[PDB]
Design a protein around this ligand. Sequence first.
Ligand SMILES: NC(=O)c1ccc[n+]([C@@H]2O[C@H](COP(=O)([O-])OP(=O)(O)OC[C@H]3O[C@@H](n4cnc5c(N)ncnc54)[C@H](OP(=O)(O)O)[C@@H]3O)[C@@H](O)[C@H]2O)c1
Ligand SMILES: NC(=O)c1ccc[n+]([C@@H]2O[C@H](COP(=O)([O-])OP(=O)(O)OC[C@H]3O[C@@H](n4cnc5c(N)ncnc54)[C@H](OP(=O)(O)O)[C@@H]3O)[C@@H](O)[C@H]2O)c1
Ligand SMILES: NC(=O)c1ccc[n+]([C@@H]2O[C@H](COP(=O)([O-])OP(=O)(O)OC[C@H]3O[C@@H](n4cnc5c(N)ncnc54)[C@H](OP(=O)(O)O)[C@@H]3O)[C@@H](O)[C@H]2O)c1
Ligand SMILES: NC(=O)c1ccc[n+]([C@@H]2O[C@H](COP(=O)([O-])OP(=O)(O)OC[C@H]3O[C@@H](n4cnc5c(N)ncnc54)[C@H](OP(=O)(O)O)[C@@H]3O)[C@@H](O)[C@H]2O)c1
Lengths: 257, 254, 244, 257
Amino acid sequence: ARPGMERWRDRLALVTGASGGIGAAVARALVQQGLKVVGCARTVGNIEELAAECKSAGYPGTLIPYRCDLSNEEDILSMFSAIRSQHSGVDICINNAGLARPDTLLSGSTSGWKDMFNVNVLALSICTREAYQSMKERNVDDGHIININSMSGHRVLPLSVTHFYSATKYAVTALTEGLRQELREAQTHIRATCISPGVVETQFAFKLHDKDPEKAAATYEQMKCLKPEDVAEAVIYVLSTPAHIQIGDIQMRPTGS
Amino acid sequence: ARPGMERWRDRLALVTGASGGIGAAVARALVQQGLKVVGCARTVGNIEELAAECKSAGYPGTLIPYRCDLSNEEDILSMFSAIRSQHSGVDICINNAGLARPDTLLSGSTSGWKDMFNVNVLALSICTREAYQSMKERNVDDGHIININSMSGHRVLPLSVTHFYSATKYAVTALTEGLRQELREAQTHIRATCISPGVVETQFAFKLHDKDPEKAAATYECLKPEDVAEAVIYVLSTPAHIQIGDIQMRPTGS
Amino acid sequence: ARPGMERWRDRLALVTGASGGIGAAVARALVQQGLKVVGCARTVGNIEELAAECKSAGYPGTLIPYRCDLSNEEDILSMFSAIRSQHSGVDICINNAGLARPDTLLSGSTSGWKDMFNVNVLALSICTREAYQSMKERNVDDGHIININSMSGHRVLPLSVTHFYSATKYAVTALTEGLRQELREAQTHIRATCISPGVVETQFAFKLHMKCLKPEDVAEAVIYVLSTPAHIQIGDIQMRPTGS
Amino acid sequence: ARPGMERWRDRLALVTGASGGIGAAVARALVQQGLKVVGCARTVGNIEELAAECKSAGYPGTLIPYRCDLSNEEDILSMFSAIRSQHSGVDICINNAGLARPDTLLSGSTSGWKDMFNVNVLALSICTREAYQSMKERNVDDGHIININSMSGHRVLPLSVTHFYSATKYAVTALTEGLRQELREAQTHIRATCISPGVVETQFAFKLHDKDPEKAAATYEQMKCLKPEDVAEAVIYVLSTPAHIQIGDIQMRPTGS
Ligand SMILES: NC(=O)c1ccc[n+]([C@@H]2O[C@H](COP(=O)([O-])OP(=O)(O)OC[C@H]3O[C@@H](n4cnc5c(N)ncnc54)[C@H](OP(=O)(O)O)[C@@H]3O)[C@@H](O)[C@H]2O)c1
Ligand SMILES: NC(=O)c1ccc[n+]([C@@H]2O[C@H](COP(=O)([O-])OP(=O)(O)OC[C@H]3O[C@@H](n4cnc5c(N)ncnc54)[C@H](OP(=O)(O)O)[C@@H]3O)[C@@H](O)[C@H]2O)c1
Ligand SMILES: NC(=O)c1ccc[n+]([C@@H]2O[C@H](COP(=O)([O-])OP(=O)(O)OC[C@H]3O[C@@H](n4cnc5c(N)ncnc54)[C@H](OP(=O)(O)O)[C@@H]3O)[C@@H](O)[C@H]2O)c1
Ligand SMILES: NC(=O)c1ccc[n+]([C@@H]2O[C@H](COP(=O)([O-])OP(=O)(O)OC[C@H]3O[C@@H](n4cnc5c(N)ncnc54)[C@H](OP(=O)(O)O)[C@@H]3O)[C@@H](O)[C@H]2O)c1
């Protein structure tokens, strides 16, 4: 394993939105590094497929698929309860699931705004709380919570269909800093970090533009983009840092963008 | 009327959360300046009370009380419908209603997080959308949307009970900038501004510390609600070609 | 007088870069409101002409021209010494003098970088310091220091020729906040404020003969800030043209 | 070499402020990874000793000490001239030299403010420009400029003795972002990054608190601060990223700080 990842061997990571994109790349990378990974999403079949690939590849870690709709609070609580009932717990929580719906501020549907909040902010916060509560009861003083933010959490770009999304990522910027603060107040060494990528070639733009597949291809064919593996490598760097270092944010963009 | 406020005479402002605090002060100030103000909240009796006082004092504007629970979208849609069919439409929207519940990130209730989002962000966005649509249908090119933000929309203070609240105000910071961009894309001269106060002596802290009113009293024993209303007047009074983006304000020496 | 300006009557405001543009508008507005204003710049002819215009209009205040090159610290200290001697001290400091030079990060001149720092940051900090020390020695507890910043002090626009200038305005954003902090630490009610306008019409453009702010718009924001009751501290006013 | 550092082998990095602290650690790390490093500062004897340590360790890279007072532009120009004539040019520029003097906004000496500007902002900008021009003349399209920023370049802490220093670091935040935009406009793949640490255990606090060395020791004893090697490891991560990735900022603090 990568230098600095030894101490995480066999410890359990949760990766939300592991059925594709960034989350699948992060899950793959943690399993390559010898972690037990619970990966969750709606499209559980993709996670099972990834786990089978990890097993065929001979990786030291294990990917454990779990079906969970993050828009459903009980689904999340049930997942954490299932982990607890099994005498286990999450030591690393990667809050990766997220989405944009093309609901502008001047004419957007309230349902799309709610959907963005439900996953990007509320589910991220419920997972953060439940992961922390499990660490606490297990006397884990050195776990790590990593939120997948965005450059859109730091500046608002003049694309109307992502304005509300950008506002949810601004919330993630503030939540990650507030989290760091509460973990200090609780007198722990549990770490909190954001990773803030620019455009990454995943299914994200295809879901945003679900009524205009061509507009989604052009986000990606026309621009140099990051790859989900690049974000996964940033997560590996953050986890591999020794315990007294707390990476607050890594802002990353495609070169020349 | 204050210089710059003449052009707003008899035009309609919606002020959300007008039943106390900053909202009540903004409503009273706009009525003093000759506007028609629809003031909404759940506690409609207070807003009615502010109307008899406004009226007793012989002010030039009018306060129209309206009962609306902003946590219910259908209630908000009904309100805009009544404004459009009874008062023509809305030219100024002051998104003032907001709250903090003491739900920390490490142990807070999801219900509290949802409640803060529902009023501070969702209702603010629904009202923005409907006010804009009202202006669009009446070919109003010079309306104004003013979001009541907070210094907590620009920095995260180490007070665990207001972390989630702060995150909703960061969302307000981003939405107000997004709004400006959309209004420019729409080729309008409609203006979008936030006002970002530090501590204001209202009922806000008493509600946040509902289980510890002594802590709420310590907060204040600050800016006054009238102070924020004066910032709203300055913003509206500015020439049409000026778009104030934000006014950050704190008590002196705080 | 505008409501809230009464308490500033006959008190002294220093307005740096008063010979045109924002500074001249700010000086005129404060004179109209009955302040004693010291307006400085490298050459005083325009400030003399403004003072004569104010006197002809019957304004209640007075404008006092002072020649000062803000790139020379000794010139600045001499200006404060003169103000202390002849007019008691400074109660309001408007740090308005500023400049942008088109010295890019990849190819710019060091002389241009230094000039921008010298005026935008160092002179502003020297004036801030001397103004505070003036208030302190007179037990003035309610003075006001106002820095004229820029929207470039809050975001970096992809225009190469203003990047270094933008970095100096980010510095001013940080200094204004640090100043607030120090004034609170000193147990005073002296106020500190930034005004951050975007595209303002330049004197250049004006002389040559909405998509722009006018100098008067910035002066009106200064009047709003000063007019706030003493317990209110405006930290920043960000403003841009509606049509920008 | 570390995965990703191979493409930098035998290429030349300039590390300013290499006579101690973070810059000495960065210079050592780059020499370990096989680069040619020009390390400069006023206290050139320290850099000679570091070069001797690196040679003694049998590291693949080489450290070239160079005496340069960064407050003197002619000194910097002569250094770049020497690098050009003797070592072709600069492909990586680490703008590390920096200082804080305890000159508060209300009563500070102007000389302290000018000293902070001269090194933290002016020297950093001069070295950036000359490093870019060095790349340009050699048709280098993949260099890297890394500025050592600070968390104080992102928030103003209520410590009066560091207010002006914080303002110099806000300038670095803005300069790094403007540098990215110019390198993009120049149609290059030259990368621009800053690293923004919280408290790092170096001589920095001792120099800031030159009249109260007890205050400097209290800083480093109250908690397990960042070490210079931790910042060097962040620099190695940034350099090791494939060329299409452009890290914009890494914000890092001591855990629990
Ligand atoms: N791609 C980019 O340009 C970009 C840039 C910056 C940041 N980000 C952030 O990166 C993170 C990952 O997105 P991505 O780019 O990998 O997009 P993606 O390919 O669309 O993947 C999103 C993942 O989130 C999961 N998800 C969405 N809604 C869910 C729900 N209700 N319940 C459970 N899982 C749900 C999806 O799985 P199921 O549909 O199977 O549930 C999928 O696994 C997001 O937070 C996004 O904001 C992306
Ligand atoms: N006070 C401060 O320290 C402070 C500082 C910075 C910013 N702010 C912001 O200022 C704004 C106003 O707050 P305030 O200080 O005036 O607090 P406040 O005294 O508690 O008043 C809040 C108002 O919002 C209304 N409101 C809350 N939930 C509502 C709902 N579901 N439907 C309709 N109305 C609702 C309330 O009326 P009903 O209960 O009758 O519905 C009340 O009139 C908020 O956005 C707040 O975040 C306050
Ligand atoms: N114009 C804009 O688009 C804009 C936008 C945002 C912020 N701002 C800021 O607003 C402030 C005023 O700018 P402006 O538009 O009014 O520009 P301006 O017309 O160029 O005014 C600059 C003023 O500063 C004075 N000045 C410059 N260097 C000086 C020095 N060495 N010593 C003494 N005085 C000096 C000039 O007078 P002398 O040359 O006679 O000495 C002049 O009175 C500056 O801080 C600027 O950065 C301007
Ligand atoms: N230490 C921290 O808590 C901390 C936190 C955040 C960021 N930083 C940043 O990290 C960077 C490195 O600082 P450090 O902590 O390593 O401090 P340090 O131990 O004091 O080292 C500073 C280095 O800068 C060099 N330098 C100073 N003035 C110079 C000049 N005129 N010409 C040439 N070199 C000069 C010094 O060498 P000579 O004296 O031999 O010339 C020394 O090598 C700085 O930019 C600092 O702002 C430090």
